[PDB]
């Protein structure tokens, strides 16, 4: 199922594993450290802003992790 989406979109937990490879933990962590999620989580899980995704690949695109 590849969906493509723009960086304002409703993407899932199964998606940022896919786009990162990493865990769940992960990504709560990395991408409220991004600039905070925009993404709409109102029951621990929901709908995420793929925003969220650029920003937090953003600073580890440029520290270069791993």
């Known amino acids: 199922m590849q969906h493509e989406l ?3 979109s409703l993407v899932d937990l199964k998606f940022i594993m896919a786009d990162t490879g990493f865990g769940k933990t992960f ?5 409220k ?3 905070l ?12 802003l793929y925003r969220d995704h650029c920003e937090f690949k953003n600073k580890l695109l440029s520290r270069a992790n791993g």
Not at 27 to 31: A, E, L, S, V, W
């Open 37 to 48: 999620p925009k993404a709409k989580v109102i029951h621990g899980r929901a709908r995420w």
């Open 6 to 8: 723009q960086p304002d």
């Open 33 to 35: 450290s991004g600039d």
């Open 27 to 31: 990504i709560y962590d990395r991408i």
